[PDB]
Amino acid sequence: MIGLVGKKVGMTRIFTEDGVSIPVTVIEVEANRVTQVKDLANDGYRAIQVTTGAKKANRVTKPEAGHFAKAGVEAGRGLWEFRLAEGEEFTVGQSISVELFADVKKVDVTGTSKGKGFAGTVKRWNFRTQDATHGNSLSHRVPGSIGQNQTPGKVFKGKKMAGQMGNERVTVQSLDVVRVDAERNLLLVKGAVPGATGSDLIVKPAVKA
Amino acid sequence: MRHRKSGRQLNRNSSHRQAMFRNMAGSLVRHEIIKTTLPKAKELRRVVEPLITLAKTDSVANRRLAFARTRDNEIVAKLFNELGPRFASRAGGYTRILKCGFRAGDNAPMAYIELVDRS
Amino acid sequence: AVQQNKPTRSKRGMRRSHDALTAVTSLSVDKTSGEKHLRHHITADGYYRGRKVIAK
Amino acid sequence: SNIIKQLEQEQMKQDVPSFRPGDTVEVKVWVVEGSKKRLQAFEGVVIAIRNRGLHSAFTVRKISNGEGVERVFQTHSPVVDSISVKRRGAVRKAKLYYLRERTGKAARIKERLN
Amino acid sequence: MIQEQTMLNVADNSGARRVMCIKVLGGSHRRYAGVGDIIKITIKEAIPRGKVKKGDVLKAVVVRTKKGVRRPDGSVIRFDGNACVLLNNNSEQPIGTRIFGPVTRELRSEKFMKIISLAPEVL
RNA sequence: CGAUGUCGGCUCAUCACAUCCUGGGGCUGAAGUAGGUCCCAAGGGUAUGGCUGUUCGCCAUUUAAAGUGGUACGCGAGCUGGGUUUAGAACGUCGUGAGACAGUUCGGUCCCUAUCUGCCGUGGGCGCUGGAGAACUGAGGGGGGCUGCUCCUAGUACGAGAGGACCGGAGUGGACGCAUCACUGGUGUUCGGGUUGUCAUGCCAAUGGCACUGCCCGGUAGCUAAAUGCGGAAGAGAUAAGUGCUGAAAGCAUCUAAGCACGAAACUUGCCCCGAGAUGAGUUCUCCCUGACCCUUUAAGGGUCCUGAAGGAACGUUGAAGACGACGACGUUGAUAGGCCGGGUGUGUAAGCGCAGCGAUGCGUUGAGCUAACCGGUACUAAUGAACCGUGAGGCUUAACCU
RNA sequence: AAUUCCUUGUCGGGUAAGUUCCGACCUGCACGAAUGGCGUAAUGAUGGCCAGGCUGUCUCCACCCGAGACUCAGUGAAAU
RNA sequence: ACACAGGUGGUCAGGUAGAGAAUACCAAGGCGCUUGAGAGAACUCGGGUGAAGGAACUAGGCAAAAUGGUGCCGUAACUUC
RNA sequence: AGGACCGAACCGACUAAUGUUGAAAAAUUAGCGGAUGACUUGUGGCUGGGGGUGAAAGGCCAAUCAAACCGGGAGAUAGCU
Ligand SMILES: [Mg+2]
Ligand SMILES: [Mg+2]
Ligand SMILES: [Mg+2]
Ligand SMILES: [Mg+2]
Ligand SMILES: [Mg+2]
Ligand SMILES: [Mg+2]
Ligand SMILES: [Mg+2]
Ligand SMILES: [Mg+2]
Ligand SMILES: [Mg+2]
Ligand SMILES: [Mg+2]
Ligand SMILES: [Mg+2]
Ligand SMILES: [Mg+2]
Ligand SMILES: [Mg+2]
Ligand SMILES: [Mg+2]
Ligand SMILES: [Mg+2]
Ligand SMILES: [Mg+2]
Ligand SMILES: [Mg+2]
Ligand SMILES: [Mg+2]
Ligand SMILES: [Mg+2]
Ligand SMILES: [Mg+2]
Ligand SMILES: [Mg+2]
Ligand SMILES: [Mg+2]
Ligand SMILES: [Mg+2]
Ligand SMILES: [Mg+2]
Ligand SMILES: [Mg+2]
Ligand SMILES: [Mg+2]
Ligand SMILES: [Mg+2]
Ligand SMILES: [Mg+2]
Ligand SMILES: [Mg+2]
Ligand SMILES: [Mg+2]
Ligand SMILES: [Mg+2]
Ligand SMILES: [Mg+2]
Ligand SMILES: [Mg+2]
Ligand SMILES: [Mg+2]
Ligand SMILES: [Mg+2]
Ligand SMILES: [Mg+2]
Ligand SMILES: [Mg+2]
Ligand SMILES: [Mg+2]
Ligand SMILES: [Mg+2]
Ligand SMILES: [Mg+2]
Ligand SMILES: [Mg+2]
Ligand SMILES: [Mg+2]
Ligand SMILES: [Mg+2]
Ligand SMILES: [Mg+2]
Ligand SMILES: [Mg+2]
Ligand SMILES: [Mg+2]
Ligand SMILES: [Mg+2]
Ligand SMILES: [Mg+2]
Ligand SMILES: [Mg+2]
Ligand SMILES: [Mg+2]
Ligand SMILES: [Mg+2]
Ligand SMILES: [Mg+2]
Ligand SMILES: [Mg+2]
Ligand SMILES: [Mg+2]
Ligand SMILES: [Mg+2]
Ligand SMILES: [Mg+2]
Ligand SMILES: [Mg+2]
Ligand SMILES: [Mg+2]
Ligand SMILES: [Mg+2]
Ligand SMILES: [Mg+2]
Ligand SMILES: [Mg+2]
Ligand SMILES: [Mg+2]
Ligand SMILES: [Mg+2]
Ligand SMILES: [Mg+2]
Ligand SMILES: [Mg+2]
Ligand SMILES: [Mg+2]
Ligand SMILES: [Mg+2]
Ligand SMILES: [Mg+2]
Ligand SMILES: [Mg+2]
Ligand SMILES: [Mg+2]
Ligand SMILES: [Mg+2]
Ligand SMILES: [Mg+2]
Ligand SMILES: [Mg+2]
Ligand SMILES: [Mg+2]
Ligand SMILES: [Mg+2]
Ligand SMILES: [Mg+2]
Ligand SMILES: [Mg+2]
Ligand SMILES: [Mg+2]
Ligand SMILES: [Mg+2]
Ligand SMILES: [Mg+2]
User: Where in the sequence is the domain holding A143, given as residue range(s)?
Assistant: First the structure.
């Protein structure tokens, strides 16, 4: 089954009658509108290409606006693409609402994580700091040793070192969907999804069930 | 990391930044146009423009506040006697940054920051 | 922490391959005084986007 | 945001009484033991109030059986049932964290008469 | 959040006033022990004529923490100290007959029905 | 020997399998539970402390288990320097003595700004055969793979009882990892207040400067963990040891020779991420350009004038993006940033005035005043009209289709 | 034992657990009486051990303030 | 060797607080230390604060943290008193 | 009264960190010891190399000491590189 493209509005809590506070992540899901249907005869696979949101008319380019004009649909802020299962099809100018998740129970939310910048191995790879006293010379947060002596004159591939942390695609699996509010285009999932506030989210039904 | 934060450090401590923007705000009120670096001008807008909004309501308390911020009664007098009623209708934006090139000593990008109702 | 062989002038030129300066693309022209300046900067005489913002 | 505020104002409780720090409050909460909901009372001094709308909370300290007990109630939770100001107090702080080392005569607070 | 070398007060009439945690049971590399958790302890201070003696090694169940315990509304219940009730090593039933101070609802089970029976107040 | 730093600890590790746990089996002098032994199996996992310089070891208490080894007895241009192994001093012992003792004892300088390989990240160039904007496929690569306990099945099978299951199902944890900041908290030298000394603003009052932010008390956003969400799978395929079916060779027998079936945390998939420089440079969609002439050495040739597209780049306002580049948003047809208005939050009833009091002070005005990064708004200021790069229909050869 | 190889001697104390410490024993490898013997109040930037308080030493690190590191302009090394 | 965070004898000794020539803030007087401008990564240096625990770290409580003043009460073994 | 006590000047140098092509061919920062005495300091003088001096470490004698420095014997000698 396909997913929908939303946006992280923020987090809040749903007080049940029983006295339980459910930490939820509000995901507004506007009308995803299809722009292209891909198939086996032309594209080798079955998928749809959707768009959501709006865009400035002076900023949407002539190739992109011609691509939306062929589908006959308003330009959105992006283009995403969802693989189709069998027995599942959609038309081109079709709009897809959040009622698709009306009877799902768990979703997988894919987002782009927050940018931690250039991070050290303590933060990134959870390395232990060395001793803050007892003689330590300028070596409190360094990674320590990185190899062995002459046997493989070389550091191995994938050695855990410092570098860019975050700002990348991650997927949180098996999030309990709490509420599907079709009237104001919302989706409340239990827990914390990746991404900052106002960033794009991809909500798909859970594959692991 | 610097997420959602504000205020420039400017390679100074907090008391040096506070005394530098106090002097620079007094010099801008005194002459109505100065030439400083563009980062100092941008951080100065966040100092001077609250003083003018404070100066729109001439009370004794607001004279004492503007004195605690500027520490110059001549500046507080020019604020409440001239620039108050001069800017009494503008909804913010009381000043203007004009980039004026590069300083000869260190290639620093300079800028003229002036009040709007000067000329 | 120091080299074991002298690096060549070829490696020196390849390291300096990216140290080239980017010339300014185009100078903006004031509409009143007609003189050239940096885009978004005031002119030398004190014009910017037509008006005389400062005497000299 | 407006969406958050709309989701939160429909869950807030419209009958939260006005109480300040240093007020001796009595909170009646719901207790589910076995299958019978009963209503346990908790009464102490408000040492802290955190106002965040729906996420608002408050801290009550009491001296129960010789032991000091702090308890951080969620204000708009439905598991609390009643909030009653027994005795209002006169302090000049927002948070009375210094009462955690004062006992007996030293931990008195005078009454905020109005 | 109780670990090794943590001193605890004693919440019963077993005869001890001050015990020290030497091992947090139930899992390898297990850092902490909250309420309802079994800890192996040693005795550092006792009454002169008690059921237990200074230097005995036995189990105990944590009943009050200064860190506190969270309820599903988000609320938390903190105490001013750390308190435990002594247990037997094998049968793991409480030794004393009279529980001092309050306990919590996380304690109640088929295992600690005696403690909730004897506590003066259950929060 | 014109120098290859030699114990132990720390920090990072990585491989082997002669496997410690978990997994699959065979035999048992295997009733069950629990074991013994051997075979297959390296996917993941695989204690904290006391003593001691120690590795080790003993001891205490855990745990599913506390594996055995290689790696310059891994790792000092990564740390340490307790031990060993400099110069000082002393004991015992030897020697007439200077002095000496894998005998002891106290003290005792551990340098290097990284050129290359390597590795972690991040860019520039060019290419992919007209140029450009997007969405993809997925060759390949990496990540991840742990497990307890309880309950039901069932006090059933088994057993004289004591005791006590296989198989299967459900729940709740520990360790680890990813993400997040709604909660609980931390910080919050950019917010508010109290207060000590001193100086100053003419003085009072009120403020400001310095004293570690002067010392304190709280605390917004943000970042965070101790906080709270999620994960490990199921499944499929082919198998290991092993179990078989039919069945001869070898009239029987026989799991194998022909043929067929089952079979594990291993293997390939399934889950997540990168990924067409995958030079084997792929696919789809869309957009842009449809001018004249000279040349000689006539060819994938060179030049002139006109033209300058799609788009990009640059600049500017900037960002929960960021070392720099990069990436993303916006540039007046505009909410990009600052300001401003309103709100919220925090602090905790400002100043001034009046009253009471000899006065310190208290009370009223007053939950006042101030309020950072927050929320909703608002063109007041700054984001310029341009200019720059990029062209002008895109090779040959066959094949097929259509004329 | 600043001396004891065997040795982490044995016993006791202290600790959950103590090759160190303290007190005993004496089997003094290889103490011993001015290259002094045994005690000893006070003192010691002396050596070993223990306890209370205290705490980022640590479990396990988090945030913040500044000086560098990074970028721009100017000058401009070195070992090898 | 330097316009070098070193070394160099004598004399003068203001105010407020303070026992004080300590220390804090100031006067007279003299300086802002001869590269700057930004940004606000890792890491290092020097500091601030920290939930719960409180030496479990370590060769070793190294380093940090803590104590800290005046007056009064009171103050052990031992002792060469 | 005191080779008495606490503690600045002053003298010294116990610990840690930095620094180690340093700010510095031994220093800085935070702590530390003595501080009316066998104290410390200025100026001038004397002791000379197998010699001085030494509360004694083979310490010091001009950044040099198990026998200084300079010049000379001297192109010592080198079965060694
Ligand atoms: Mg970021
Ligand atoms: Mg460590
Ligand atoms: Mg060093
Ligand atoms: Mg350090
Ligand atoms: Mg090789
Ligand atoms: Mg901002
Ligand atoms: Mg600078
Ligand atoms: Mg200051
Ligand atoms: Mg070589
Ligand atoms: Mg270069
Ligand atoms: Mg050698
Ligand atoms: Mg060599
Ligand atoms: Mg077996
Ligand atoms: Mg094998
Ligand atoms: Mg393994
Ligand atoms: Mg596998
Ligand atoms: Mg051990
Ligand atoms: Mg100990
Ligand atoms: Mg290896
Ligand atoms: Mg070996
Ligand atoms: Mg080794
Ligand atoms: Mg090495
Ligand atoms: Mg080593
Ligand atoms: Mg090396
Ligand atoms: Mg040593
Ligand atoms: Mg010697
Ligand atoms: Mg020897
Ligand atoms: Mg390329
Ligand atoms: Mg793979
Ligand atoms: Mg939070
Ligand atoms: Mg807080
Ligand atoms: Mg916070
Ligand atoms: Mg003051
Ligand atoms: Mg006054
Ligand atoms: Mg001053
Ligand atoms: Mg399988
Ligand atoms: Mg087989
Ligand atoms: Mg057969
Ligand atoms: Mg047959
Ligand atoms: Mg099969
Ligand atoms: Mg498993
Ligand atoms: Mg505005
Ligand atoms: Mg005030
Ligand atoms: Mg008032
Ligand atoms: Mg009132
Ligand atoms: Mg308020
Ligand atoms: Mg406001
Ligand atoms: Mg806003
Ligand atoms: Mg002897
Ligand atoms: Mg021995
Ligand atoms: Mg013993
Ligand atoms: Mg010890
Ligand atoms: Mg002894
Ligand atoms: Mg002797
Ligand atoms: Mg004799
Ligand atoms: Mg003697
Ligand atoms: Mg430069
Ligand atoms: Mg050279
Ligand atoms: Mg100088
Ligand atoms: Mg000097
Ligand atoms: Mg004075
Ligand atoms: Mg910093
Ligand atoms: Mg501190
Ligand atoms: Mg604070
Ligand atoms: Mg702490
Ligand atoms: Mg605090
Ligand atoms: Mg605390
Ligand atoms: Mg220890
Ligand atoms: Mg240890
Ligand atoms: Mg110390
Ligand atoms: Mg200290
Ligand atoms: Mg004396
Ligand atoms: Mg010193
Ligand atoms: Mg003294
Ligand atoms: Mg000697
Ligand atoms: Mg000398
Ligand atoms: Mg001589
Ligand atoms: Mg001689
Ligand atoms: Mg001769
Ligand atoms: Mg010669």
Answer: 1-209
Contact criterion met (CB below 8 Å) for D79 and E74 = no
> Which residue's CA is nearest to the C1' of nucleotide F179?
A194
DSSP D51-63: --GGG-EEEEEEE
- What is the C-alpha separation between C23 and C33, in angstroms, rounded? 24
Which parts of A16-53 are beta strand (E)?
A: 21-28, 32-38, 47-51
Contact present, A154 and A72 (Cβ < 8 Å): no
Cα separation of C27 and C37, whole Å?
6
What number of residues does chain A have?
209
Number of domains in chain A: 1
Q: Is E55 left (phi over 0), alpha (psi -120 to 50) or beta?
A: left
Return d(Cα D110, Cα A159) in angstroms, integer.
64
Strand pairing report for E83-87 and E7-10: parallel
Query: Which of E76, E107, E112 to mutate: most D Cβ within 10 Å?
Result: E76
* C-alpha distance from residue A69 to each of A73, A115, B66, C49 (Å): 6, 35, 59, 39
* Residue (of E96, E90, E97, E92) closest to E109 by Cα position: E92
As a rounded value in angstroms, the CA-to-C1' distance for E85 and F32 is: 39
CA neighbours within 13 Å on the CB side: how many for A144? 10
Distance E90 CA to ligand 7 centre (A): 68
Would the Cβ of A128 be found within 7 angstroms of any atom in strand H? no
Which is nearest to A38 in space by CA: A79, A4, A78? Answer: A79
- The H or E element containing residue A9 is strand A4-15
Asked whether residue E81's C-beta has any atom of DNA/RNA strand H within 7 A, the reply is: yes
Task: Report phi then psi at A126, rounded to 5.
Answer: 55, 40
**Residue found under tokens 């009623």:** B85
CB E18 within 8 A of CB E9: yes
Q: For residue A65, which of A181, E46, A57, B46 has the smallest C-alpha distance?
A: A57
The H or E element spanning position D33 is strand D24-33
Structure tokens at B77: 């007098």
HSE of B9, CA atoms in CB hemisphere, 13 A = 4
Query: What residues does each domain of chain C span?
Result: 1-56
Alpha-carbon distance of C18 to A91, in angstroms, equals 51
Measured at the CA of E102, the angle between CA D110 and CA E75, to 5 degrees, comes to 75
Taking the CA of residue D63 as centre, how many other CA atoms within 13 Å lie in the half-sphere pointing to its CB?
9
**Specified resolution (Å):** 2.9
What φ, ψ does residue C5 adopt, rounded to 5°? -140, 155
How far is the C-alpha of A24 from the C-alpha of A138, rounded, in Å? 44
A129 CB-near residues (< 8 Å, 6+ apart): A122, A140, A141
Nearest to residue A173, comparing CAs of A206, A140, A198, A142? A206
Please, are residues D68 and D104 in contact by the beta-carbon 8 Å criterion? no
